């Protein structure tokens, strides 16, 4: 099938996501609605259930609402069984309508539906070419109080109705018993509770295995992607081990939530996105779009910087999920603000790099502050708004114009208020002009593009006051005026004659797994795929088309590789880098080193005998290690993903800048478990 097909669970770049809060979309089946003091059919009390379900979702899909808009994927609330307790948070009653308070991951939330409802959901969606994504939140169970076992459901965890354990008297130690985090350090928000939420302990085998098994069920249910909650609050290594489990079974596009504040830029965030096996919600894009188009606290120059920098910081920028708002911020649209801002920001996001996500009700200009305020019931299914039409006109271009889905980004004109960018992929080009100034037009002269000579109509049809464009020879545009609040899109498409790789997924897996290579100009006859210098052809290439290739990863040694393709005639493609070949199935192991005392600005790292550990390369060492919560300095710890059942040799080191100090003696040695987790404790050899 082509790259754009609904069946492509590895690439969401040509798609447009619609983020839905199940409870607040549509109640197609009142019968499953909760009753009593947990329900509010008026949905005036934003903390109880309003009754939205899967059925309601099916209904909107079938009656043309989402399809009419151009949406091609839907992202919904965590489907698992939540707690039933109404929780009084100082006079206010709170229900689990949000689905973030899990009690059993192998069961559904009856307020949303039955498994059969779920299966119908996927069916209906699929039938209409819409992919399905679900939230997944393995960091915790529910709000619990260690000495007030009667409070809520005491963070109890079940396994398909079977009681695993509770927060009080946690002998098995399923949970963390370290107190609450003050979000002070990365280490602090990982090993402590998020408020009163029962913190799961990924280091306990039971927990480890339970979670890995739970996600398979859903995978077996046919989901197209997973949205991970609180990735920044769980151990990185465990998460990488989780990714491996998914990818080594049934790979699906996975993205996590790692909140970034205004003007915040984190290297940890980059690294996670680059090596964990999942991509992230592009908080950096979001924050910056808001400042520029909404709060007006930065200008075009700032957008431009975020664009060029992110491109450099993320190994796979096109896998970052963009948006303008979501359930964790106030609605972009403000009561009394000019709608044109929300419109401009939608246009922008839609034609920009990444995977655009639209928060339900945006197209309806919903207003609302922070939680619970940004979680109201969509008040209407009108296709008549300007926003609905914007999406409707742009969304489809992600499928038909590869420049938009996979192209580079390039600034071609700019000032404080204006920004003209060019996207390019093969013989495809898209040019976008935005004039944030709602009061002043701009004189546009000196514009050069890669567009062929000719005239171009605004793809928006003038909806946002766009205009036509006249490109002369040399792609130089003739002078024009860009109306105040003006937005225009122009484009050029044509066949690509040379193999050009636009995307790869999954990006990390063991040999034998089939990966997906999307692009253009691959031709129709099988060619060759290169993993590094190793060539793959024939049978192992399970399928080959012009825009997509499916191939089994050869049994090469664990590591990082570049991928490349060559057509049947031997013409080679561009290189796609950063593919990680695992050394085998993975397990999560806690490494602990005793008495490794450092000096300031000097940390301990870990390295060893396998690719998962850097292969003795200090530039690729794991770390820096943690040292405050679980184990206190001078003891250091760290949760690492390693090849299951393999015998491994390792050593700790002290780095400072790029200046290294090795532990003395001989490598330590250990054999990873076949499954479950383990804890290796040793002392620093001087």
Ligand X SMILES: OC[C@H]1O[C@H](O[C@H]2[C@H](O)[C@@H](O)[C@@H](O)O[C@@H]2CO)[C@H](O)[C@@H](O)[C@@H]1O
- Catalytic residue set: 229, 257
Q: Which does 601 bind (CB under 5 to 8 A by kind): Ca ion, ligand X, none?
A: ligand X
- Asked if 446 is part of the footprint of ligand X (rule: CB under 6 A), the reply reads yes
The stretch among 195-203, 410-418, 486-494, 499-507 that binds ligand X (CB under 6 A) is 410-418
CB 647 within 8 A of CB 616: no
Give the Cα separation of 488 and 467 in Å (integer): 6
What's the min distance (Å) between Cβ of 28 and Ca ion?
Answer: 7
When the beta carbons of 234 and 444 are compared against ligand X, the nearer one is 444
What's the min distance (Å) between Cβ of 191 and Ca ion?
Answer: 7
What's the min distance (Å) between Cβ of 609 and ligand X?
Answer: 7
CB 349 within 8 A of CB 322: yes
> Quick one: which of 107, 288, 412, 423 contacts ligand X (CB under 6 A)?
412
What's the min distance (Å) between Cβ of 644 and Ca ion?
Answer: 23
The full length of the chain comes to 686
Q: Which does 616 bind (CB under 5 to 8 A by kind): Ca ion, ligand X, none?
A: ligand X
Q: Looking at residues 34 to 63 of the shown chain, list those that interact with Ca ion (rule: CB under 5 A).
A: 51, 53
Residues in Cβ contact with 53 at an 8 Å cutoff, skipping those fewer than 6 apart: 22, 23, 26, 27, 28, 29, 32, 111, 112, 113, 117
When the beta carbons of 202 and 655 are compared against Ca ion, the nearer one is 202
Q: Which does 578 bind (CB under 5 to 8 A by kind): ligand X, Ca ion, none?
A: none
Q: What is the CA radius of gyration of the chain?
A: 26
Q: Looking at residues 228 to 267 of the shown chain, list those that interact with Ca ion (rule: CB under 5 A).
A: 233-234
Regarding beta strands 469-471 and 454-456, do their DSSP bridges make them parallel or antiparallel, or are they unpaired? antiparallel
Annotate 642-670 with b (16+ C-beta within 10 A) or e (fewer): bbbebebebbbbbbeeeeeeebeeeebeb
When the beta carbons of 334 and 414 are compared against ligand X, the nearer one is 414
CB 188 within 8 A of CB 181: yes
| Concatenated DSSP letters of 91-141 | S-EE--TTS-SEEEEEEE-TTT--HHHHHHHHHHHHHTT-EEEEEE-TTEE
369, exposed or middle or buried, with CB in 10 Å at 0-12, 13-18, 19+? exposed
- Asked if 639 is part of the footprint of Ca ion (rule: CB under 5 A), the reply reads no
Binding mask 116-155 for Ca ion (x = CB under 5 A): -----------------------x----------------
Q: Looking at residues 447 to 486 of the shown chain, list those that interact with ligand X (rule: CB under 6 A).
A: 448
Q: Which does 599 bind (CB under 5 to 8 A by kind): Ca ion, ligand X, none?
A: ligand X
Q: Which of the 8 DSSP states describes residue 12?
A: -
Q: Which does 457 bind (CB under 5 to 8 A by kind): ligand X, Ca ion, none?
A: none
What's the min distance (Å) between Cβ of 594 and ligand X?
Answer: 15
Give the Cα separation of 406 and 486 in Å (integer): 25
| Concatenated DSSP letters of 489-503 | EEEE-----S-EEEE
Q: Looking at residues 632 to 671 of the shown chain, list those that interact with ligand X (rule: CB under 6 A).
A: 633, 651, 662, 667
When the beta carbons of 80 and 434 are compared against ligand X, the nearer one is 434
| Per-residue tokens: 361 | 């009700």
> Quick one: which of 3, 23, 27, 275 contacts Ca ion (CB under 5 A)?
27
Give the Cα separation of 99 and 81 in Å (integer): 8
What's the min distance (Å) between Cβ of 616 and ligand X?
Answer: 4
Size of the site for ligand X (CB under 6 A): 20
What's the min distance (Å) between Cβ of 215 and Ca ion?
Answer: 17
Q: Which does 516 bind (CB under 5 to 8 A by kind): ligand X, Ca ion, none?
A: none
Q: Looking at residues 592 to 621 of the shown chain, list those that interact with ligand X (rule: CB under 6 A).
A: 598-603, 616
| Concatenated DSSP letters of 356-409 | EEEETTTTTT----STTTT-PPP----S-SHHHHHHHHHTTHHHH-HHHHH-EE
Residues in Cβ contact with 265 at an 8 Å cutoff, skipping those fewer than 6 apart: 284, 309
What's the min distance (Å) between Cβ of 176 and ligand X?
Answer: 19
CB 249 within 8 A of CB 513: no
When the beta carbons of 573 and 627 are compared against ligand X, the nearer one is 627
CB 565 within 8 A of CB 530: yes
Helix 386-394 with 339-350: angle, nearest 10 deg: 10
What's the min distance (Å) between Cβ of 580 and Ca ion?
Answer: 25
- Asked if 32 is part of the footprint of Ca ion (rule: CB under 5 A), the reply reads yes
H-only helix segments in 539-648: none
CB count in 10 Å sphere of residue 594: 12
Q: Which does 136 bind (CB under 5 to 8 A by kind): Ca ion, ligand X, none?
A: none
The stretch among 25-33, 284-292, 306-314, 373-381 that binds Ca ion (CB under 5 A) is 25-33
Size of the site for Ca ion (CB under 5 A): 10
- Asked if 414 is part of the footprint of ligand X (rule: CB under 6 A), the reply reads yes
**By three-state DSSP, how is residue 3 classified?**
coil
Q: Which does 33 bind (CB under 5 to 8 A by kind): Ca ion, ligand X, none?
A: Ca ion
- Asked if 381 is part of the footprint of ligand X (rule: CB under 6 A), the reply reads no
- Asked if 392 is part of the footprint of ligand X (rule: CB under 6 A), the reply reads no
What's the min distance (Å) between Cβ of 194 and ligand X?
Answer: 21
When the beta carbons of 114 and 597 are compared against ligand X, the nearer one is 597
The stretch among 148-156, 265-273, 310-318, 411-419 that binds ligand X (CB under 6 A) is 411-419
When the beta carbons of 33 and 493 are compared against Ca ion, the nearer one is 33
When the beta carbons of 601 and 686 are compared against ligand X, the nearer one is 601
CB 327 within 8 A of CB 371: yes
| Concatenated DSSP letters of 149-199 | TTSTTTT-EEETTEEEE-STT-SS--B--S-B--S-STTTTTSSBBTTEEE
CB 553 within 8 A of CB 506: no
Query: Phi/psi at 658 (nearest 5 deg)?
Result: -110, 20
**Residue whose CB is nearest to ligand X in the complex, by number:** 446
CB 312 within 8 A of CB 320: no
Pseudo-torsion of CA 99, 178, 599, 271, nearest 10°? -10
CB count in 10 Å sphere of residue 379: 11
What's the min distance (Å) between Cβ of 180 and Ca ion?
Answer: 11
- Asked if 33 is part of the footprint of Ca ion (rule: CB under 5 A), the reply reads yes
The stretch among 33-41, 318-326, 452-460, 493-501 that binds Ca ion (CB under 5 A) is 33-41
When the beta carbons of 214 and 442 are compared against ligand X, the nearer one is 442
What's the min distance (Å) between Cβ of 276 and ligand X?
Answer: 22
CB count in 10 Å sphere of residue 671: 12
> Quick one: which of 388, 413, 421, 531 contacts ligand X (CB under 6 A)?
413
> Quick one: which of 29, 181, 588, 627 contacts Ca ion (CB under 5 A)?
29
Phi-psi region of 187 (alpha: psi -120 to 50; beta: other; left: phi over 0): alpha
Give the Cα separation of 513 and 503 in Å (integer): 17
- Asked if 450 is part of the footprint of Ca ion (rule: CB under 5 A), the reply reads no
Q: Looking at residues 140 to 199 of the shown chain, list those that interact with ligand X (rule: CB under 6 A).
A: none
When the beta carbons of 325 and 639 are compared against Ca ion, the nearer one is 639
Which residues make up the interface to ligand X (CB under 6 A)?
411-415, 446, 448, 598-603, 616, 627-628, 633, 651, 662, 667
Which residues make up the interface to Ca ion (CB under 5 A)?
27, 29, 32-33, 51, 53, 139, 199, 233-234
């Amino acid at each position: 099938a082509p790259d754009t097909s609904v069946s492509n669970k590895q690439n969401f770049s040509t798609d447009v996501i619609y983020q839905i809060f199940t409870d607040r979309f549509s109640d197609g089946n009142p019968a499953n609605n909760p009753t009593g003091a947990a329900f509010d059919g008026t949905c005036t009390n934003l903390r109880l259930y309003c009754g939205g379900d899967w059925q309601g979702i099916i209904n909107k899909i079938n009656d043309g609402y989402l399809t009419g808009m151009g949406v091609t994927a839907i992202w919904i609330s965590q489907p698992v069984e939540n707690i039933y307790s109404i929780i009084n948070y100082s006079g206010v009653n709170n229900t689990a309508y949000h689905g973030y308070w899990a009690r059993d991951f192998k069961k559904t939330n009856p307020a949303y539906g039955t498994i059969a409802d779920f299966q119908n959901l996927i069916a209906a969606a699929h039938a209409k070419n819409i992919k399905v994504i679900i939230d997944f939140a393995p960091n915790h169970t529910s709000p619990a109080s260690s000495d007030q076992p009667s409070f809520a459901e005491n963070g109890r965890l079940y396994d398909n109705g079977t009681l695993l354990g509770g927060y009080t008297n946690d002998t098995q130690n399923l949970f963390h018993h370290n107190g609450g985090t003050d979000f002070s350090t990365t280490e602090n928000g990982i090993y402590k509770n998020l408020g009163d939420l029962a913190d799961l302990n990924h280091n306990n085998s039971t927990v480890d295995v339970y979670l890995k098994d739970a996600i398979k069920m859903w995978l077996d249910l046919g989901i197209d992607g997973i949205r991970m909650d609180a990735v920044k609050h769980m151990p990185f290594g465990w998460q990488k081990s989780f990714m491996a489990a998914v990818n080594n079974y049934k790979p699906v596009f996975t993205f996590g939530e790692w909140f970034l504040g205004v003007n915040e830029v984190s290297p940890e965030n980059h690294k996670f996105a680059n090596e964990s096996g999942m991509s992230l919600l592009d908080f950096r894009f979001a924050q910056k779009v808001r400042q520029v188009f909404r709060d007006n606290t930065d200008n075009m120059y700032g957008l431009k910087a975020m664009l060029e920098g992110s491109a450099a910081d993320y190994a796979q920028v096109d896998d970052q999920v963009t948006f303008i708002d979501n359930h964790d911020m106030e609605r972009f649209h403000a009561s009394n603000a000019n709608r044109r801002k929300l419109e401009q920001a939608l246009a922008f996001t839609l034609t920009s790099r990444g995977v655009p996500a639209i928060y339900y009700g945006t197209e309806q200009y919903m207003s609302g502050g922070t939680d619970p305020d940004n979680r109201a019931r969509i008040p209407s299914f009108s296709t008549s708004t300007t926003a609905y039409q914007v999406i409707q006109k742009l969304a489809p271009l992600r499928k038909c114009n590869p420049a938009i889905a996979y192209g580079s980004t390039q600034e071609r004109w700019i000032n404080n208020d204006v920004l003209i960018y060019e996207r390019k992929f093969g013989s495809n080009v898209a040019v976008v002009a935005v004039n944030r100034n709602l009061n002043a037009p701009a004189s546009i002269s000196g514009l050069v593009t890669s567009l062929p000579q000719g005239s171009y109509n605004d793809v928006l049809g003038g909806l946002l006051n766009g205009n036509t464009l006249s490109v002369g020879s040399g792609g130089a545009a003739s002078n024009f005026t860009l109306a105040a609040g003006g937005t225009a899109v122009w484009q050029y498409t044509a066949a690509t004659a040379t193999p050009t790789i636009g995307h790869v997924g999954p990006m990390m897996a063991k040999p034998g797994v089939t990966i997906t290579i999307d692009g253009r100009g691959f031709g129709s006859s099988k060619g060759t795929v290169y993993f590094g210098t190793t060539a793959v052809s024939g049978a192992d290439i399970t399928s080959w088309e012009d825009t997509q290739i499916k191939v089994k990863i050869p049994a090469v040694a664990g590591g990082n590789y570049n991928i490349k393709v060559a057509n049947a005639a031997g013409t080679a493609s561009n290189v796609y880098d950063n593919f990680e070949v695992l050394s085998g199935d993975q397990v999560s192991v806690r490494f602990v080193v005793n008495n490794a005392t450092t000096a300031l600005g000097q940390n301990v790292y870990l390295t060893g005998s396998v690719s998962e550990l850097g292969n003795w390369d200090p530039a690729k060492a794991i770390g820096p290690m943690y040292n405050q919560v679980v184990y206190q300095y001078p003891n250091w710890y760290y949760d690492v993903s390693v090849p299951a059942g393999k015998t491994i040799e390792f050593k700790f080191l002290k780095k400072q800048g790029s200046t290294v100090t090795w532990e003395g003696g001989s490598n330590h040695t250990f054999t990873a478990p076949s499954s479950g987790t383990a804890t290796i404790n040793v002392n620093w050899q001087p």
